[PDB]
């Protein structure tokens, strides 16, 4: 897609992506803040602290 | 209009910007994931389900 900027204006594409990414970074950091697991500002413990076994992802764990 | 060499320069600048941000953000997400993996296992990662009932949970 080398010639994309020949057709689509790169300058405003980059300006708009910068504005949208400022908004997106704010939104995503706010999503993390809202999360108890991920709010570094409140510093809640991870559930991994209190569980002996690894929780995993895609691990097909059972009760 | 945009000349061939001007589009070339824009292309290198765009590649540098996007790839630098992409790699820095990949390292950032890898670090945040190693710190606390984003996606819970089947058991979840809610504190209330694993903490010993005196650890307060905001959830």
């Amino acid at each position: 897609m080398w010639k994309l900027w020949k057709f689509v204006d790169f300058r405003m594409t980059a300006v708009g992506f910068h504005l949208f990414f400022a908004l997106l970074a704010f939104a995503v950091h706010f999503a993390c803040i809202s999360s108890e697991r991920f709010n570094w500002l409140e510093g809640a413990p991870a559930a991994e602290y209190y569980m002996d076994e690894d929780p995993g992802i895609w691990k097909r764990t059972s009760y | 209009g945009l000349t061939d060499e001007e589009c070339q320069e824009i292309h290198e600048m765009n590649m540098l910007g996007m790839h630098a941000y992409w790699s820095i953000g990949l390292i950032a997400n890898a670090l945040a994931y190693a710190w606390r993996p984003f996606h819970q296992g089947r058991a979840g990662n809610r504190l209330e389900d694993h903490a010993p009932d005196y650890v307060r949970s905001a959830l």
Binding site: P55, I57 | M15, H19, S23, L26, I27, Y33, A34
Partner: peptide, 26 residues
């Protein structure tokens, strides 16, 4: 477990996509 797998995948992607290497495959 698989958290290390995701971290390794993200690190590999970051290393591959870094400009000093992203430009090598231009």
């Amino acid at each position: 477990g698989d958290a290390g797998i995701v971290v390794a995948v993200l690190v590999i992607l970051a290393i591959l996509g870094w400009p000093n290497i992203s430009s090598t495959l231009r």
